[PDB]
Subunit: 30 residues, 3 copies
């Protein structure tokens, strides 16, 4: 339910971390 | 109270997809 | 349990927003 939801928030965390490790790559390189 | 929470986890779910998408485009157009 | 899930979820809604801008400024500088 919530182990399913702290799992949702689990997936979104993983994702925003990669999304910054990249938006911050581009940013440098571009 | 689940309405709200299980609806914002939609707003962000959406947006993780757009952005994943968008970043990827940029990455491609900048090699 | 819930608050936590709404702690999480709120923060993420503000990282989320900061990144959306980021990808437009980027979008333009290209």
């Amino acid at each position: 339910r919530m182990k399913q939801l702290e799992d949702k928030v689990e997936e979104l965390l993983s994702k925003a971390y990669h999304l910054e490790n990249e938006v911050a790559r581009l940013k440098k390189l571009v």
